[PDB]
């Protein structure tokens, strides 16, 4: 919507059979319409023999119907609708929502209502259609497998314990998807899909009179049948201290939490709007304070946060969560409990409450006098949120007044009282995630309450106060170095400058830079450099990157960059160090100045370091026993023999100090740098800033870091270790080959042709291929064609896949046709011209040029690249993509 439309007119209605509808006429944009229907049934309503059936019905109502034996979605496809973009369904615990955006907007309204009434009142739910649809539902079930989903179920089981939700995931079970008969879906549909259990909303360019005549036409005849009464949406709250582990052997989660559960909709005889306003004020106040409380946490805990979430229609959960140093879960839960007790002892900061409520009053004041206007998609979002809750929309103008009124009856003592109610909830829960094989015994409730009593009896210091904001400033730099030499590449608009400290500038005066400067600073200081310690170097690089200069902080660094619209980022790879940044040209001194400070005055923010150590430790604990850690180790032994480096043991990790890490960083920062600078400005503007900030950094010659090169030969392994029901097939092949721009393009062209041929050659659905990837490139640093073919597939015929792809490769060089190359050449030509004037391409080719030629020639003559694409050259290169003498095969199968 380009012209925002004002607050719409709402018309509500109810047919005789109980069907409810909401008509929302916007004055624009012309023809746009959005149509949605909710059936108040979700997975929570399934019986024990109905697992996944709410969601299966949401699929099946698009198949055969009374009016459409070939399927509702079939009919829609024939009239130009696309799945997802034009029609969609979403099922959750409580409700099923059908959404329609007809291609012709409001002209298609009647066809949309005929389709929706067919879906909700006349679905056949045929066994034949279900047996066809099971393919799609099984595929969604497979894609919802993995560690994130498994941990989400761990969390639901704990935080919603004693409710219907843990046993009712929306997707259901593999057995139910495979085995549930259409008859069960029909009974579920006939139980819940009734007009008094359904509601419709139409938003946009409509005539409310016409629309509701269309609604009567398609929905009035549905028989009025009641659905069962339901009062099972909440966990059964009771006074308790429940203790749970959140556990998955592939999860790096290392975390403790303490949670209160309570009825969040009880407003205690007061305005319910005012109650939700007290909740917002309380959460903002607590969020401010609990961040300050980070200074009380011992080394085993970090990042104490408070979160509030809905866990039923009326129940909420208020949780305190903190990351844990693996092995330190006992000390961490005690620290969480101490901080909770401190919140029971002391009132919330009165200045915060004043500031928070004043901020809300300002917004509410502005809302109350501003006519509400929105774009179409925003109206749909705002209206759908309230309609899904089955509540009327209240406009932002009215809500602004409502807030001002409620704010007048809110004092600090109301906030404190609201907060203490949550902390007094008798239904409580302690949760532990402990990664990998870390020794752990689930504490008994008595052990947790023993800590609560300890802190209840202890003397606790007041809540921490807000600390003064650090306002960072770059130092004055008055030492200047000198440029000692200039080499000119006028044809490429490049100058190369030698500086007195040994650095060099490769400056490209590209008009495509506009009013910005682009910096890429490279040196040979990868973390495999011989003077360094690989894991410590990588940790130091990341900590300096996030912390900024010694006298700053992670957060003052982020604020300072934002203010100057400036970026600068450290990336230390195995073989090189790259600092990359952009600034406006008027910020050039601030970009070079920050760059210099990272080199000579690196910082380590203690909060950032503590968090980074937690992250490394929990991943180490997981990787030591996970599937992913096992695969990485076996792939390493197959391709390289031994790892180049490894993360430390956790006990060594815990000993790391800031001076040790800064020592590593200074080893990287001493390597001489080439500054690739893209800036459309005169040298007279650039050179003084170069000489002041970049020529003055101490350097010492560094050696080149040897590349990490996969070993030659044929090796294979098969590991039955997967925890999902899938096979992963990986093959690597390489051929040494000198890098030229022409050869790289030819490799790329043959790759595209090979991918399509290998995919066509493995088209058979009987093979069970879920995903398939063919990668190949002439890697320019290693100067080898590196080819990688990847499979994910059902386990049954995984052993055959690489064999079929191996045969495809041997056929490829005689199956490539003149038309294939002609298509690819024309497609390359079109891409190459879209890369003209592209700054990302220009910067990459400049840097590649210096790597191979030590000059910028690659910025010129790109129009001749396509000429190296011929039928002969592509076929001769397709024959090098796969080299049978250098082949490593790794097959991962499900565990026995």
């Amino acid at each position: 919507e380009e012209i925002k439309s004002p607050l719409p007119v709402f018309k509500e209605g109810t047919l005789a059979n109980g069907f409810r509808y909401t008509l929302v006429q916007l004055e624009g944009p012309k023809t746009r319409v959005d149509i949605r229907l909710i059936v108040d049934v979700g997975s929570i309503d399934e019986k024990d023999n109905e697992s996944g059936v709410a969601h299966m019905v949401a699929h099946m109502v698009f198949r055969a119907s009374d009016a459409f034996p070939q399927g509702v979605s079939t009919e829609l496809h024939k009239q130009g609708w696309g799945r997802g973009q034009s029609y969609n369904a979403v099922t959750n615990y409580e409700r099923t929502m059908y959404m329609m955006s007809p291609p012709k907007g409001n002209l298609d309204l009647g066809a949309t209502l005929q389709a929706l009434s067919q879906m909700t009142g006349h679905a056949k739910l045929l066994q034949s259609d279900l047996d066809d649809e099971r393919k799609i539902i099984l595929e969604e079930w497979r894609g919802k497998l993995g560690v994130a989903e498994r941990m989400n179920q761990q969390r639901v089981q704990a935080i919603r314990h004693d409710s219907r939700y843990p046993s009712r995931p929306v997707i259901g079970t593999e057995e139910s998807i495979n085995d549930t008969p259409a008859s069960v879906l029909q009974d579920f549909y006939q139980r819940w899909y009734h007009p008094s259990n359904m509601r419709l909303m139409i938003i946009g360019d409509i005539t409310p009179a016409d629309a509701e005549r269309e609604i009567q036409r398609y929905f009035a005849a549905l028989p009025n049948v009641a659905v069962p009464t339901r009062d099972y949406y909440e966990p059964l709250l009771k006074p308790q201290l429940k203790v749970a582990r959140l556990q998955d052997s592939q999860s790096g989660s290392s975390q403790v939490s303490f949670v209160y559960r309570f009825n969040d909709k009880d407003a205690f005889g007061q305005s319910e709007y005012r109650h939700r306003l007290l909740t917002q004020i309380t959460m903002s106040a607590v969020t401010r304070q609990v961040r300050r409380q980070k200074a009380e946490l011992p080394q085993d805990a970090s990042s104490l946060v408070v979160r509030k979430s809905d866990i039923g229609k009326t129940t909420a959960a208020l949780g305190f969560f903190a990351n844990v140093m693996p092995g330190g879960h006992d000390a961490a839960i005690s620290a969480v409990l101490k901080e909770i007790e401190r919140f029971k002892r002391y009132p919330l900061n009165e200045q915060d409450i004043t500031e928070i409520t004043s901020d809300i009053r300002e917004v509410a004041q502005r809302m109350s006098v501003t006519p509400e206007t929105r774009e179409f998609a925003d109206w749909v979002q705002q209206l759908t949120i309230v309609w899904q809750q089955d509540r009327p929309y209240v406009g932002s103008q009215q809500r602004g007044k409502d807030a001002l009124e409620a704010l007048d009856t809110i004092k600090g003592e109301d906030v404190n009282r609201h907060w203490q109610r949550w902390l007094a909830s008798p239904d409580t829960l302690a949760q532990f995630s402990v990664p990998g094989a870390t020794p752990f015994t689930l504490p008994k409730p008595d052990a947790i309450s023993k800590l609560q009593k300890q802190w209840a009896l202890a003397t606790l210091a007041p809540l921490r106060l807000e600390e003064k904001k650090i306002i960072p400033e770059l130092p004055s730099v008055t030492q200047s170095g000198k440029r000692t030499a200039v080499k000119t590449f006028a044809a490429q608009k490049v100058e190369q400058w030698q500086l007195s400290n040994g650095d060099r500038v490769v400056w490209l005066r590209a008009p495509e830079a506009g009013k910005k400067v682009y910096l890429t600073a490279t040196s040979q200081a990868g973390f495999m450099a011989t003077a360094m310690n690989p894991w410590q170097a990588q940790l130091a690089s990341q900590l300096v990157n996030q912390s900024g200069p010694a006298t700053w902080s992670g957060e003052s660094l982020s604020n300072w960059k934002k203010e100057k619209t400036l970026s600068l980022s450290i990336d230390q790879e195995a073989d090189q160090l790259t600092l990359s940044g952009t600034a406006p040209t008027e910020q050039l001194a601030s970009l070079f100045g920050l760059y210099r400070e990272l080199n000579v005055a690196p910082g380590i923010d203690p909060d950032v370091m503590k968090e980074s150590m937690m992250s490394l430790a929990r991943q180490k604990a997981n990787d030591d026993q996970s599937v992913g850690g096992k695969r990485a180790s076996e792939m390493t032994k197959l391709r390289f023999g031994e790892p180049a480096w490894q993360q430390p043991e956790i006990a060594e990790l815990k000993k790391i100090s800031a001076p040790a890490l800064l020592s590593q960083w200074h080893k990287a920062a001493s390597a001489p740098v080439t500054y690739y600078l893209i800036a459309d400005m005169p040298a007279t503007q650039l050179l003084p800033q170069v000489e002041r900030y970049l020529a003055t950094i101490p350097r010492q010659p560094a050696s080149e870091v040897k590349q990490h090169l996969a070993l030659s030969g044929k090796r294979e392994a098969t590991s039955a270790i997967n925890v999902e029901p899938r096979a992963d097939i990986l093959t690597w092949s390489f051929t040494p080959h000198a890098w030229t721009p022409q050869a790289a393009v030819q490799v790329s062209i043959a790759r595209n042709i090979a991918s399509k041929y290998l995919k066509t050659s493995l088209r058979d659905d009987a093979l069970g291929i879920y995903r398939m990837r063919v990668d190949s490139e002439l890697e320019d640093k290693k100067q080898r064609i590196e080819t990688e073919v990847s499979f994910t597939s059902a386990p049954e015929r995984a052993q055959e896949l690489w064999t079929l792809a191996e045969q495809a490769f041997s056929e490829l060089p005689t199956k490539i046709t003149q038309q294939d190359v002609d298509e690819q050449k024309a497609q390359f030509i079109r891409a190459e011209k879209g890369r003209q004037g592209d700054l990302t391409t220009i910067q990459r080719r400049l840097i590649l040029s210096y790597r191979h030629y030590n000059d910028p020639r690659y910025l010129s003559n790109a129009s001749k690249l396509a000429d190296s694409i011929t039928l002969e050259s592509v076929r001769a290169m397709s024959a090098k993509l796969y080299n049978p003498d250098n082949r490593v095969l790794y097959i991962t199968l499900p565990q026995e």
Binding site: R276, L277, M283, S284, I360, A403
Partner: peptide, 7 residues
């Protein structure tokens, strides 16, 4: 969650 958006 948030009843009056501040950010």
């Amino acid at each position: 969650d948030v009843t009056i958006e501040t950010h």
